[PDB]
Design a protein around this ligand. Sequence first.
Ligand SMILES: Cc1cc(C(=O)N2CCN(C)CC2)sc1-c1cc(O)c2nc[nH]c(=O)c2c1
Ligand SMILES: Nc1ncnc2c1ncn2[C@@H]1O[C@H](CSCC[C@H](N)C(=O)O)[C@@H](O)[C@H]1O
Ligand SMILES: [Mg+2]
Length: 214
Amino acid sequence: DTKEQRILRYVQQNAKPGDPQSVLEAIDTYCTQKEWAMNVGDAKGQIMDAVIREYSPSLVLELGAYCGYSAVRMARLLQPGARLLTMEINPDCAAITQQMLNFAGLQDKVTILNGASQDLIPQLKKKYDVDTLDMVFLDHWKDRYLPDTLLLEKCGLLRKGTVLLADNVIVPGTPDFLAYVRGSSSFECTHYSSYLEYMKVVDGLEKAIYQGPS
Ligand SMILES: Cc1cc(C(=O)N2CCN(C)CC2)sc1-c1cc(O)c2nc[nH]c(=O)c2c1
Ligand SMILES: Nc1ncnc2c1ncn2[C@@H]1O[C@H](CSCC[C@H](N)C(=O)O)[C@@H](O)[C@H]1O
Ligand SMILES: [Mg+2]
């Protein structure tokens, strides 16, 4: 028995199959009541929703799936024929995410890439026929926000207007990523102040929109 297995079991036992919203509510509730977990959460999640609806991205890359929360959260808002790719380094997590998605009936929108973002990113074009990404959600590991951003730019995966949206720019924090995007002419940055999931510690998401080469 693992915490993530408990979360998936709670969903299967409580959420309406095929209804993404009830799946989100089931997760939020269990982690609000029984056991904190690092899902992006409902407060930050509403900000994500608002940004998704603005940009209506056809191709979203997620870094870090975990239990599938934000994948569910995002894919439920995708237009028909839009796809989300999510990268997960931990097999136990990737398979729980696959199940969470299957239960919400979003499996056909979502493709889980198993492995480390740094290894998978260079393989997107060949193995998944990706041209450029419309949106990227950074939410794996703070140390990799900056390295992986440079990777994406280098692998030609960013176009003018690509939206990078980063979670935890305040807690646990991503100082170097923040300083880089805020300092670079290649990004237009906006900060959304929210709260750490299932808590009232202050956190935020950063939107950094790629402007193209300088
Ligand atoms: C693991 C962890 C602990 C945090 C914290 O301050 N505390 C936790 C424990 N509780 C009890 C107090 C407060 S915040 C956080 C966290 C939150 C995310 O949203 C993350 N997203 C992606 N990848 C991460 O590593 C990630 C970690
Ligand atoms: N370098 C990396 N490449 C791919 N996945 C990574 C990674 N570093 C950490 N991860 C994974 O990213 C997850 C961070 S928590 C992700 C939560 C998710 N975005 C949500 O809001 O629901 C963890 O499951 C961790 O195993
Ligand atoms: Mg997070």
